[PDB]
Structures are given as C-alpha cells and as structure tokens.
C-alpha cells in the first residue's frame, strides 16, 4: 500500500468586507488610531511631516485629508512613535499637535461603552465607501479597499447643522447730579 495524499485546497483569494484577518500594512485604519498630526503650519505637504519625523523616528507613511488640517502617519516601530511624542509633545514649543493610539481589535463589545460613545473606526466606513465607492460606481467592491475596511454597515454620511447659542444685548448707563440752588441779597 501507499500513503498517497488526497487533500484538496484552492488558492488564496480576496475576502468580503467582513474579514479582519487579511489587512495590509498600508492604507488601513481599522482598530488603529495611529499617530495623528494636527495643526500643521504647512500647506498640506506630506513630505515636510516626514522632514520632521526623519530624525530619531521611523515614519514610512503620511496622509493629509480634509480642509481642516487633519493628518495621520504610520510608523514601523512603537519606540520611534514615542520619540515623536517626546519632542513634539514635550519640547514646550510644539509645532505640531501630535497624539497617538492603538486598538487591540476589540471582541464581544456588546456593551453600552460601545453604544453611547463615538469612535473613528466607523467614519472609515461611511467616508471611504461614499467618497471613493459612491460617486460613479455602486457601493461595496467598487474599489480595492474591500481588503482593509472590513465594515459593511448601511450607514452613510447624513446629518443637519444644529445651533443652541444664546446672547443678550446690553448698553451703558447715564446719570447726572444737579445740586440745589439758592438766591442772595
């Protein structure tokens, strides 16, 4: 007899927008708040944010989005991450508003601490599927971003402005003093 193999397994292929186990090391923001860069004095030049994360740091990706100076950068080491927050958050003359964070890929988060709290890991769903997969194409699988976002909720960017400001007008006061008057001989 012979111990011949009779197993069958097809080649690996892309996954639907629900598989948090095929994410690339680039162009991803699921469960990662990454190194945020705010208040950039620059005219949105991603090569100058690397020009200040060149020394004592290991940044290898920079992105600048929105007309409100919102940027994120990706580093290949968490020790060079803390070297950026060292200089750019403790030199007393911060040229950039640097903040960082990481998610451990939450599980069974069926709690009200994830039902009455906002998180950036849902603005990736409605802002990349609307503005890159809902302009001249149908949503879901209209772009290669279906291998990272892994969120497929029916929610889209919808809302209206609200104001609750209250003010009151005031004016200075005016007073005079006129003492008594008496005649004379």
From Swiss-Prot:
Domain RRM: 33-103
Disulfide bonds: none
Domain of life: Eukaryota
Feature: compositional bias, Polar residues: 165-176
Coiled-coil stretches: none
Localization (cell): Nucleus
Entry function: Plays a role in sequence-specific regulation of nuclear pre-mRNA abundance.
Note: Present with 19600 molecules/cell in log phase SD medium.
Name of the protein this chain belongs to: Protein NRD1
Residues of the full protein shown: 307 to 491 of 575
């Amino acid at each position: 007899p012979d111990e011949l193999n009779v197993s069958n397994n097809p080649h690996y292929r892309p996954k639907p927008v629900s598989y948090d186990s095929t994410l690339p090391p680039d162009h991803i923001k699921v469960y990662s708040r990454t190194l945020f860069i705010g208040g950039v004095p620059l005219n949105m030049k991603e090569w100058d944010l690397a020009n200040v994360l060149k020394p004592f740091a290991e940044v290898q990706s920079v992105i600048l989005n929105n007309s409100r100076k919102h940027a994120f950068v990706k580093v290949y080491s968490r020790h060079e991450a803390e070297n950026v927050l060292q200089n750019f958050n403790k030199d007393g003359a911060l040229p950039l508003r640097t903040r960082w964070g990481v998610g451990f890929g939450p599980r069974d988060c069926c709690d009200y601490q994830h039902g009455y709290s906002i998180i950036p890991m849902h603005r990736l769903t409605d802002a990349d599927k609307k503005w890159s997969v809902s302009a001249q194409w149908g949503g879901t699988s209209g772009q290669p971003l279906v291998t990272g976002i892994v969120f497929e909720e029916p929610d889209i960017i919808v809302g209206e402005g609200v104001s609750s400001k209250a003010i009151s007008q005031k004016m200075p006061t005016d007073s005079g003093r006129n003492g008594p008057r008496s005649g004379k001989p």
